[PDB]
Design a protein around this ligand. Structure first.
Ligand code: CL
Ligand code: MG
Ligand code: MG
Lengths: 11, 65, 65
């Protein structure tokens, strides 16, 4: 597949 | 990563519309049944309607054990 | 980092649980109007019936241009 999204940053 | 299968917990919701992606809410426990590549797991869980659903999702959105 | 306002393009969808967030599909062109902190932007785009949709989102989900 393509790239996975990165882990979102802490809010 | 341990050897498959192993349990992960969603750290964020994943709500992709891509066919064959697994979707889940934050805190969802998921069994990873295969490592698809460097960035994606394949796994499954029994949803709130009692149905086993499966598909791929980001390793980055979950935490092992 | 370029001075605001500036254009970014979503590299992934961003769908989250928080009302303050901007959510979008991959390829969505967004105008960043505020850099919120080291990891988040605030910006906008126009929906189907021309309404401005705005909110915060991770810098890591977009690329500048
Ligand atoms: Cl969220
Ligand atoms: Mg912060
Ligand atoms: Mg084992």
């Amino acid at each position: 597949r393509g790239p996975a999204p990165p882990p979102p940053p802490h809010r | 990563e341990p050897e498959v299968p192993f349990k992960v917990v969603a750290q964020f919701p994943y709500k992709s519309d891509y066919e064959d992606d697994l979707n889940f809410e934050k805190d969802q426990e998921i069994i990873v049944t295969s490592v698809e590549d460097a960035e994606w797991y394949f796994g499954e869980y029994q949803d709130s309607n009692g149905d086993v659903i499966e598909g791929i999702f980001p390793k980055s959105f979950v935490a092992v054990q």
